[PDB]
Amino acid sequence: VKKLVIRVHMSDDSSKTMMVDERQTVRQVLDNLMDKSHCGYSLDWSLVETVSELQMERIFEDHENLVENLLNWTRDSQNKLIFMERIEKYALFKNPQNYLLGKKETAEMADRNKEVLLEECFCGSSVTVPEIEGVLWLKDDGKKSWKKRYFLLRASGIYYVPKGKAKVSRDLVCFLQLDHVNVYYGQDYRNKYKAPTDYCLVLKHPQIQKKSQYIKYLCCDDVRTLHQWVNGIRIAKYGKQLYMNYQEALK
């Protein structure tokens, strides 16, 4: 089993090398990062990749084979790995009442009922995602201009209406199937793409590493809409496996 030394940027901009092997999940790699750094355990420690050509980043899911993802990088990639606490990773699981009923409206829930609610959504014969709908900005292909379109998340991918800026259901066409796209956060898209706000998500194939028309750029009204959409997209991509990651992480 092949070994690889990766370089990881820590929370204070310093960097460390460490050996990983081709069988390891991100979870296993993070467990090592935690041991060697003496940072103390927590389900919120995360491994984050930047895609340098495209100024965006994602938190890997813990079940993912690290080495396999890294092979997607170009030979001369300036992508970085970053080891930092990210609350975004398990927010959804800590407070599911805020994502799985929506109800953008934010609220408490008793622990035991959080538990029931995740069981209902993730543990049946299939994942029962509640659908996310709302207007969002879509960057024009290869241009720094945006347009409001209405969006709808089904278990079968993202859909949208290409005509106008309103909810017209019969005119929902495939916007993007999720099987072979990861979802990222864009960094400072306000400036780089003249985004209407900074609350931006990006969908692309793992293998695309530079400018491409097949990269989809979305901008949200506020940080809540951003969170709901990213979590929703994550459920519909990864399903019950997200739940298993959380259960496993929560030592």
Side-chain angles (χ1 to χ4, degrees):
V1 272
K2 305 137 128 213
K3 310 284 153 181
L4 173 82
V5 194
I6 63 168
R7 192 160 78 95
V8 184
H9 299 77
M10 313 303 266
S11 332
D12 58 353
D13 217 348
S14 72
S15 80
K16 274 163 189 170
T17 55
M18 75 153 349
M19 191 181 69
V20 301
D21 74 42
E22 72 183 310
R23 286 177 67 91
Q24 283 176 319
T25 65
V26 166
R27 164 51 48 207
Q28 282 169 295
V29 163
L30 285 169
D31 291 346
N32 288 343
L33 281 161
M34 298 186 282
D35 302 329
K36 287 291 176 70
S37 61
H38 319 297
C39 67
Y41 207 85
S42 164
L43 81 169
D44 289 318
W45 290 102
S46 299
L47 198 66
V48 177
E49 72 180 336
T50 68
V51 181
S52 198
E53 262 295 290
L54 291 173
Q55 211 179 285
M56 61 181 84
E57 68 172 33
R58 66 174 195 106
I59 304 149
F60 287 112
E61 315 300 332
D62 288 341
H63 70 107
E64 292 192 75
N65 189 288
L66 184 53
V67 167
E68 146 192 315
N69 278 296
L70 291 191
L71 297 179
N72 291 327
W73 286 16
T74 56
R75 309 196 147 77
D76 57 346
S77 199
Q78 317 195 56
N79 291 352
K80 299 183 173 173
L81 256 26
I82 315 186
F83 173 69
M84 54 189 315
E85 270 160 304
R86 297 292 295 256
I87 68 181
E88 295 109 337
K89 183 172 68 177
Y90 293 124
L92 153 83
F93 286 85
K94 305 197 200 152
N95 292 299
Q97 78 284 9
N98 291 320
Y99 303 81
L100 311 175
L101 340 148
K103 252 49 74 59
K104 198 148 175 278
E105 239 293 353
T106 178
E108 295 315 318
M109 184 187 256
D111 281 337
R112 285 167 73 73
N113 294 337
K114 275 158 188 187
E115 225 197 348
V116 166
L117 181 65
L118 305 160
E119 277 158 14
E120 290 182 340
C121 153
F122 289 106
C123 299
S125 46
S126 87
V127 171
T128 50
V129 209
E131 319 197 302
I132 320 301
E133 105 250 43
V135 175
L136 290 172
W137 308 88
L138 174 66
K139 194 178 97 61
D140 289 309
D141 288 348
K143 285 201 278 182
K144 290 187 189 158
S145 43
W146 305 69
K147 295 197 188 188
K148 275 178 127 33
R149 309 282 186 205
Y150 176 84
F151 281 93
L152 195 138
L153 176 78
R154 292 192 183 105
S156 56
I158 306 182
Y159 293 80
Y160 82 138
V161 188
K163 217 309 293 290
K165 60 196 168 169
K167 174 194 139 193
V168 181
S169 299
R170 76 163 160 301
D171 274 339
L172 286 161
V173 307
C174 180
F175 171 79
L176 205 60
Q177 295 206 11
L178 291 176
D179 306 85
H180 309 290
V181 303
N182 293 334
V183 59
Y184 308 69
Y185 298 106
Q187 294 322 304
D188 189 40
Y189 275 13
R190 255 295 224 183
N191 294 313
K192 173 158 204 51
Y193 290 113
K194 304 323 195 197
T197 93
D198 259 333
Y199 315 111
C200 289
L201 65 154
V202 181
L203 309 145
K204 66 155 200 71
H205 192 290
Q207 293 194 259
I208 286 166
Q209 291 292 310
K210 53 170 188 150
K211 297 273 184 286
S212 188
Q213 61 186 168
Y214 310 123
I215 303 169
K216 299 295 186 200
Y217 301 81
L218 297 169
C219 183
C220 302
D221 276 336
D222 58 43
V223 81
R224 197 68 182 87
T225 315
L226 178 61
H227 289 158
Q228 285 175 210
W229 274 102
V230 176
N231 284 294
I233 297 169
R234 285 169 73 231
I235 296 170
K237 182 165 173 80
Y238 296 110
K240 164 161 182 195
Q241 179 67 260
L242 284 185
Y243 189 48
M244 303 180 58
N245 292 351
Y246 173 71
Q247 295 267 132
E248 191 172 332
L250 195 57
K251 263 194 276 150

